[PDB]
């Protein structure tokens, strides 16, 4: 489960294990111990042999820093993503799909973790759907009535207006519908009756 946090730990450990093992690699010299070279060699010739090790060890240390700069960019990208995600999912309700977890984002709770942060996105996942009969608009007084906030559904005989994410049957009145145009341009307009309060 906590695999993304062990990845950055094992990478830093492997980076320090390959760097410490490069000290046992003769870069074309007679040996790998500096004291053995300095003692068992005259000063003029020992310089040529000791320059092969300092060149390899300084290049191996530069390779470590180069990998740490590229690895820091990945951490900085994950840190800026976590800072933006916490600012948008915890301190607010984001309307971005899949950002604050899969589903309709309600809220989120941050929790500390070793070299990271664990989010608990509380999402809204609908379930137990049913198939109904829909229609764009209705025609009662020779004029089209469109759903203001909802959808015109039908159970087979009657017609109701429900929400777009939860089935709540409601009678079609002149308060949840608005009139626009006549009943000739809309394709698939059924003939129903509205109830004026």
């Amino acid at each position: 489960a906590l695999g993304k946090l062990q990845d950055v730990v094992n990478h830093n450990a492997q980076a320090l294990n390959t760097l410490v093992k490069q000290l046992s690699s003769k870069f074309g010299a007679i040996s790998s111990v500096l004291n053995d070279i300095f003692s068992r060699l005259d000063p003029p010739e020992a310089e040529v042999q000791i320059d092969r090790l300092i060149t390899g060890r300084l290049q191996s240390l530069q390779t470590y820093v180069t990998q740490q700069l590229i690895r820091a960019a990945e951490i900085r990208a994950s840190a800026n993503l976590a800072a933006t995600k916490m600012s948008e999912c915890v301190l607010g309700q984001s309307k971005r799909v899949d950002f604050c977890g899969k589903g309709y984002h309600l809220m989120s709770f941050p929790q500390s973790a070793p070299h990271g942060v664990v989010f608990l996105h509380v999402t809204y996942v609908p379930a137990q759907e049913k198939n109904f009969t829909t229609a764009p608009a209705i025609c009662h007084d020779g004029k089209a009535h469109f759903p203001r906030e909802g959808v015109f559904v039908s159970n087979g005989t009657h017609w109701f207006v429900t929400q777009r994410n939860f089935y709540e049957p409601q009678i079609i009145t002149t308060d949840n519908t608005f009139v626009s145009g006549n009943c000739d341009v809309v394709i698939g307009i059924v003939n129903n009756t509205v109830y004026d309060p």
Partner: protein
Amino acid sequence: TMSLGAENSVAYSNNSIAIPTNFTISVTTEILPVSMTKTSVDCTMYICGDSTECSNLLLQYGSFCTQLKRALTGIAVEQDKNTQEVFAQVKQIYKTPPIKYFGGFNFSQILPDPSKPSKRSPIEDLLFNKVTRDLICAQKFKGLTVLPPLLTDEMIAQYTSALLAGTITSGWTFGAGPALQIPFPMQMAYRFNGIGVTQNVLYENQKLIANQFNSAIGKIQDSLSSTPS
């Protein structure tokens, strides 16, 4: 001297307002790389090459052939992961219905064509015909090998077809839970409410918007073919 563009002076007043009277549905294109070529190197072939005495001297530089091969290995796993996070975002692989009458919108150019054996849309067919011993076999003889990706071009085409069979037959419901059926003429009626306009704008001009979408999607095949860049 490089010019920045035209100089349009919007007449600002305390009681002047510009309300639109018509709309023009436009379909724009966007190009983004998702994956890179998975490469792998061979230390013995590249460094020395068909020799035995040089291979013995290479053993001195011990941790120099395993740190590079492991670094390129992480890239190979990365390229196979960058495709799962983009294309593999839906669990169920949806299929397009047989009757392709979606209110008046013609998706024949973006839906997969069953005639060709590749099962790719005409738009995708133009894309693969532009993004191209030989060089591929020459570099192989030195240690440079191109590992094949995990997901093939056929499997990626099935992921795109699943993302189009839930975008036309459904809306924003198959990306946040179970797939909920909804007519396409009613789907854009709710998408018009997101930008500000009401639902009567779409229904009273359904045939006009359908013709503009078909004309806009038809110029994509010509725009990409004409412009070489």
